[PDB]
Amino acid sequence: MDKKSARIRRATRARRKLQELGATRLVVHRTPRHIYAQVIAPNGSEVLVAASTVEKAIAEQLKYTGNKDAAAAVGKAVAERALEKGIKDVSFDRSGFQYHGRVQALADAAREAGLQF
Amino acid sequence: AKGIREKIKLVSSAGTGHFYTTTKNKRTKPEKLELKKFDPVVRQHVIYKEAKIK
Amino acid sequence: AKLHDYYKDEVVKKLMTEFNYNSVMQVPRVEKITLNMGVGEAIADKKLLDNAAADLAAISGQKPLITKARKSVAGFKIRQGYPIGCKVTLRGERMWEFFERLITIAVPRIRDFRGLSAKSFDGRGNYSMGVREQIIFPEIDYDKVDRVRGLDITITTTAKSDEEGRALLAAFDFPFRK
Amino acid sequence: AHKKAGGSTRNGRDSEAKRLGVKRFGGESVLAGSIIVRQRGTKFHAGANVGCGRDHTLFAKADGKVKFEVKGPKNRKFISIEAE
Amino acid sequence: MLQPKRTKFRKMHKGRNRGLAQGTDVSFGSFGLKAVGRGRLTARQIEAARRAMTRAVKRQGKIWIRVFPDKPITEKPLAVRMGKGKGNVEYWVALIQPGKVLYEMDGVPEELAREAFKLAAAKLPIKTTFVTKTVM
RNA sequence: CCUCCUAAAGAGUAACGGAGGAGCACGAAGGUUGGCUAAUCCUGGUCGGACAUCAGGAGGUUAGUGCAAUGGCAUAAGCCAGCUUGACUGCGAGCGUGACGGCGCGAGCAGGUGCGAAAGCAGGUCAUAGUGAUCCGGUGGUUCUGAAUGGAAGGGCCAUC
RNA sequence: CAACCCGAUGCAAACUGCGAAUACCGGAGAAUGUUAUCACGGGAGACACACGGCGGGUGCUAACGUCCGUC
RNA sequence: GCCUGGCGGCCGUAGCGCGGUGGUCCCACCUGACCCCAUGCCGAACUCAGAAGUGAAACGCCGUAGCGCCGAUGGUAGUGUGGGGUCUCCCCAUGCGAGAGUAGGGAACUGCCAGGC
Ligand SMILES: [Mg+2]
Ligand SMILES: [Mg+2]
Ligand SMILES: [Mg+2]
Ligand SMILES: [Mg+2]
Ligand SMILES: [Mg+2]
Ligand SMILES: [Mg+2]
Ligand SMILES: [Mg+2]
Ligand SMILES: [Mg+2]
């Protein structure tokens, strides 16, 4: 994780800011309970964003039960559709740590009708 | 250098096309076998078993 | 399963009162053990002693690691590359197993038995066991032993300090001397 | 093949190190910034380091390209003159 | 402290020419021998300076002279000049104007250390700040 | 030929000046993807009585870089494994460095590749030594040429010894 | 009887956790100097330099010594 | 405005040490494991499904100058131009003027967005 260290490949791509610059990312988070996301311009404009679980959406607490490809997917859906603008602009979702399961369902949840790669 | 024991030259070759591509190798180290890809006159890569085939 | 329950059920609360904290989390936990044999053949580590892990394997029930070596040139004729180890660790449920299979079965295997070394706590809590040989944990035809270079094993625990410990181990441990 | 005699009289015939391309020039995809030779990517340099560090080119054309790794790896960002 | 022009343990190079500038020190013990006037101790001098700093009175008192060499020299026999330079065997400590000798013991030292100054390479006053508020 | 000092904080500059290294190695020791971080000491530990694999702790370039020295390295270039052949072919904005021959750096473009879900990375190795111009020829390729013409020999061109 | 770690003191071309002057690099600006600047082309000579100042290798901080730098 | 989460600007007046402190909103540790996925041994890490429990560790806060760090003013060292002694060093007119050390500073400050009152 980050406790024992930060000096790991986990930061290698986060420095997409150089060259790619304009290249925007998704970040995405784990935190057992939620998933988060948010999308900002590289570094030149953190004054941008998307949405995490955003409780209020359909009900009040984002009425959803599960966390598998079920809950994980929608976990992205919001940022995706809400950020319709940015899609063709080619964003990126940054693994953060690993690209499997939870984050996968989150990432691919966007690939459908969004983020043109 | 040109000791018949150490590094030599690998003429190398492709499968039908009459290309070349050269490189170095050895002798005592496992040999009498070789093949990579490399790009020919044109088109695709493939074959290039060079000399010393598996 | 076996023994892990003695913990919450009749082991946590002794510590919750003696030493006296307030969090069933600060209750001294048992991380793992990690066995591992040692002395390898400087030259002979090959056929000789590869059956050395065969034992530690099933003795635990996992897959040994056999480990490697981090020592360069100086006096011992090895060059930082040979196996010469075993390791094998257990933190899982199978950790309590080897526990309920120590205190009960053969902590007392040698004629020179009398209990556990009082003074062997790592300085902050854990304890390094040792002993030299025999199987102590039979599960072999037993007509094949080749005095397979012993056992180390060192139960790791979240014990805060030396003496803070003891009372922890000293709570299932029917073997520990007096 | 004996040309062994220490003497310690022996050169190196050194090259390339120099800090050419000083400051923020008018621009040009010129080298400017080389030190250790090898070099790789770089783009519109920004002068970097660590702790202290971080020179501030500010002026170039559109792709300086130079600095290997002894002096502020890569660079470039959004800096040109007005914007990038 | 001693000199024996004890070599700096061994070799690690042996070149460089010379160049002096300004002194850099105060005191440590009680009595001192300020340098003044640039020069360089033949090192062999420090041995002579000490060998003379104890004749009448026993080795009593803590003599501590504090200047350390590090400075190979080298010379040439009756030969041309292949500009290499044979061994060193000299060792001339660089001494601009520091000042270093200590005679931890209450007494008259002046007439005592000056008894050894003539052995030194050049002139050098005494001065002794038994203590310290000179420099924080 | 390569490294450091001399070399006066941009290059560069000498001496039969002070110290060392090269005339290689590598189907991987390259590429990429994913992942991982020293040395050393302290307390414990059977086969120890200086150092062997284990456990925690102090664990901070004091480690490791294929070979000198300098510079560099955690996003590791240091370490491990999977898959591979970009150690690709054709070009190259613009630069650096040379009396010159020449040498080096290089984004980007075209054709086809490998690795990655993907952004993307790859035109050999962390970089800097590991080298020999020309001529005379040898080998393969091509209707470039071929002395009346058709061939051929021989010549060119490309690849290489 | 001594490496190793704490306090107090030094030393270094091939030490640096600091760091000038300053030379050099590019950008504007006024003034001044019979483009002084650059390119291409005809003709060259010229590659033994010596001394003095400053910074240094050497040599003995010797030499109307010797080898670089700069004026 | 108080607090928490990701993501940056700054990179030691932002760090280390020591002490106190916050809770199921968050976060964490944590419950569990046939798997998708993972161990050259291990669900420790990664992975996945999530009771109950606890802020113990981590983490974030806040206090505290033991250790880092920042640091003037003055003086000194050096040095460009111009001169003058004098042995290789130094002086003076003049312009720049440190490193060390001293008083003191000091327990970071900030922005985008999301969730609790
Ligand atoms: Mg220079
Ligand atoms: Mg200069
Ligand atoms: Mg031991
Ligand atoms: Mg290399
Ligand atoms: Mg000539
Ligand atoms: Mg001449
Ligand atoms: Mg001359
Ligand atoms: Mg002369």
UniProtKB/Swiss-Prot annotation, chain B:
Annotated PANTHER family: 54S RIBOSOMAL PROTEIN L39, MITOCHONDRIAL, LARGE RIBOSOMAL SUBUNIT PROTEIN BL33M
Modification N-methylalanine, positions: A1
Ribonucleoprotein recorded as keyword: yes
GO biological process, any: response to antibiotic
Keywords tagged on the record: Methylation, Ribonucleoprotein, Ribosomal protein, RNA-binding, tRNA-binding
Family annotation (Pfam families): Ribosomal_L33 (PF00471)
Name of the protein this chain belongs to: Large ribosomal subunit protein bL33
MF (Gene Ontology): structural constituent of ribosome; tRNA binding
Further comment: Surface exposed on the 50S subunit.
GO cellular component, one term: cytoplasm
Sequence similarity: Belongs to the bacterial ribosomal protein bL33 family.
Oligomer and partners: Part of the 50S ribosomal subunit. Cross-links to the P and E site tRNAs.
UniProtKB/Swiss-Prot annotation, chain C:
GO CC, alphabetical: cytoplasm; cytosol; cytosolic large ribosomal subunit
Modified residues (N6-acetyllysine): K2
InterPro entries recorded: Ribosomal_uL5, Ribosomal_uL5_bac-type, Ribosomal_uL5_C, Ribosomal_uL5_CS, Ribosomal_uL5_dom_sf, Ribosomal_uL5_N
Transmembrane feature ranges: none
Keyword annotations from UniProtKB, A to Z: Acetylation, Ribonucleoprotein, Ribosomal protein, RNA-binding, rRNA-binding, tRNA-binding
Biological process terms in GO annotation: cytoplasmic translation; ribosomal large subunit assembly; translation
GO molecular-function terms, A-Z: 5S rRNA binding; RNA binding; structural constituent of ribosome; tRNA binding
UniProt-listed PANTHER family: 60S RIBOSOMAL PROTEIN L11-RELATED
NCBIfam families hit by this protein: PRK00010.1
Miscellaneous: Identified as a multicopy suppressor of the slow growth phenotype of an rsgA (yjeQ) deletion mutant.
Role: This is one of the proteins that bind and probably mediate the attachment of the 5S RNA into the large ribosomal subunit, where it forms part of the central protuberance. Its 5S rRNA binding is significantly enhanced in the presence of L18. In the 70S ribosome in the initiation state was modeled to contact protein S13 of the 30S subunit (bridge B1b), connecting the 2 subunits; the protein-protein contacts between S13 and L5 in B1b change in the model with bound EF-G implicating this bridge in subunit movement. In the two 3.5 A resolved ribosome structures the contacts between L5, S13 and S19 are different, confirming the dynamic nature of this interaction.
Family matches, as HAMAP family: Ribosomal_uL5_B
Curated annotation (Swiss-Prot), chain D:
Gene Ontology molecular function, alphabetical: ribosome binding; rRNA binding; structural constituent of ribosome; tRNA binding
SUPFAM superfamilies listed in its UniProt record: Ribosomal L27 protein-like
Region ranges (Disordered): 1-19
A GO CC term assigned to this protein in UniProt: cytoplasm
UniProtKB keywords: Ribonucleoprotein, Ribosomal protein, RNA-binding, rRNA-binding, tRNA-binding
GO biological process, one term: positive regulation of ribosome biogenesis
Keyword Isomerase: no
InterPro entries in the cross-refs: Ribosomal_bL27 (IPR001684), Ribosomal_bL27_CS (IPR018261)
Family designation: Belongs to the bacterial ribosomal protein bL27 family.
Quaternary structure note: Part of the 50S ribosomal subunit. Cross-links to the 23S rRNA. Cross-links to the A and P site tRNAs.
Name of protein: Large ribosomal subunit protein bL27
UniProtKB/Swiss-Prot annotation, chain E:
Stored CDD domains: Ribosomal_L16_L10e
Signal peptide stretch: none
Keywords in alphabetical order: Ribonucleoprotein, Ribosomal protein, RNA-binding, rRNA-binding, tRNA-binding
GO biological process, one term: translation
Gene Ontology molecular function terms on file: rRNA binding; structural constituent of ribosome; tRNA binding
Pfam families: Ribosomal_L16 (PF00252)
Cellular component, GO, one term: cytosolic large ribosomal subunit
SUPFAM superfamilies the record matches: Ribosomal protein L16p/L10e
InterPro entries (UniProt xref): Ribosomal_uL16, Ribosomal_uL16_bact-type, Ribosomal_uL16_CS, Ribosomal_uL16_dom, Ribosomal_uL16_sf
Gene3D superfamilies, per database record: Ribosomal protein L10e/L16
Assembly with partners or alone: Part of the 50S ribosomal subunit.
Function: Binds 23S rRNA and is also seen to make contacts with the A and possibly P site tRNAs.
Family the UniProt entry places it in: Belongs to the universal ribosomal protein uL16 family.
PANTHER family for the chain: 50S/60S RIBOSOMAL PROTEIN L16 (PTHR12220), LARGE RIBOSOMAL SUBUNIT PROTEIN UL16M (PTHR12220:SF13)
Protein name: Large ribosomal subunit protein uL16
